[PDB]
Amino acid sequence: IRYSELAPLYDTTRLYLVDNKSADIASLNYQNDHSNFLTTVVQNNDFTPTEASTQTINFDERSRWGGQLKTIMHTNMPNVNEFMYSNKFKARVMVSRKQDILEYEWVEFELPEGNFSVTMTIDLMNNAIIDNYLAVGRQNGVLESDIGVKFDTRNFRLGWDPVTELVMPGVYTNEAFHPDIVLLPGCGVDFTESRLSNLLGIRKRQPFQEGFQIMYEDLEGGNIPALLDVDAYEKSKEESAIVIQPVEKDSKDRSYNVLPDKINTAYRSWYLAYNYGDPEKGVRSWTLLTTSDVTCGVEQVYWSLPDMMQDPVTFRSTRQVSNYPVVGAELLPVYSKSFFNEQAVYSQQLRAFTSLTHVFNRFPENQILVRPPAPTITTVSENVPALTDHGTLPLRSSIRGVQRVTVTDARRRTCPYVYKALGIVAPRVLSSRTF
Amino acid sequence: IPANATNVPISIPSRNWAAFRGWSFTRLKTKETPSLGSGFDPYFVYSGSI
Amino acid sequence: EINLVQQSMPNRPNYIGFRDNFIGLMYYNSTGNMGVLAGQASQLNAVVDLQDRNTELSYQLLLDSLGDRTRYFSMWNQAVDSYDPDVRIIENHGVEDEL
Spell out which residues of chain C touch residue A397, defining contact as CB-CB under 8 Å: 44
Classify A197 as helix, strand or coil.
helix
| Element at A126 (helix H, strand E) | helix A118-129
* Chain Cα centroid distance, residue A210: 19
Q: Are A224 and A216 in contact (CB under 8 A)?
A: no
Cross-strand bridge partners of residue A393: A67
Contact with chain A for residue B15, Cβ under 8 A: yes
**Listed residue (C65, B43, C14) closest to A27, CA to CA:** B43
Closest to A32 (Cβ–Cβ): which among C32, C48, C50?
Answer: C32
| Alpha carbons A88 and A355: distance in angstroms, whole number | 26
Question: What does DSSP assign to residue C60?
Answer: H
| Alpha carbons A426 and A66: distance in angstroms, whole number | 8
Using the Cα atoms of residue A377, residue A378, residue A380 and residue A386 in order, give the sign of their dihedral: positive
| CB-defined contacts A:B, below 8 A | 27
Amino acid of residue C54: N
Residues of chain A by 3-state class (helix, strand, coil), percent to 5: 10, 30, 60
Closest to C31 (Cβ–Cβ): which among A38, A316, A396?
Answer: A38
| Alpha carbons A248 and A160: distance in angstroms, whole number | 17
Phi (first) and psi of residue A407, to 5 degrees: -120, 145
**Listed residue (A17, A16, A56) closest to A37, CA to CA:** A17
| CB-defined contacts B:C, below 8 A | 17
| Alpha carbons A155 and A152: distance in angstroms, whole number | 9
Neighbour subunits, C (≥3 Cβ pairs < 8 A)? A, B
Using the Cα atoms of residue A87, residue A90, residue A91 and residue A92 in order, give the sign of their dihedral: positive
The experimental technique behind this entry is cryo-EM
Spell out which residues of chain B touch residue C16, defining contact as CB-CB under 8 Å: 47
Spell out which residues of chain C touch residue A401, defining contact as CB-CB under 8 Å: 50
Nearest 5°: the CA angle A48, A52, A57 is 140
With a CB cutoff of 8 Å and minimum separation 6, the contacts of A198 are: A293, A296, A297
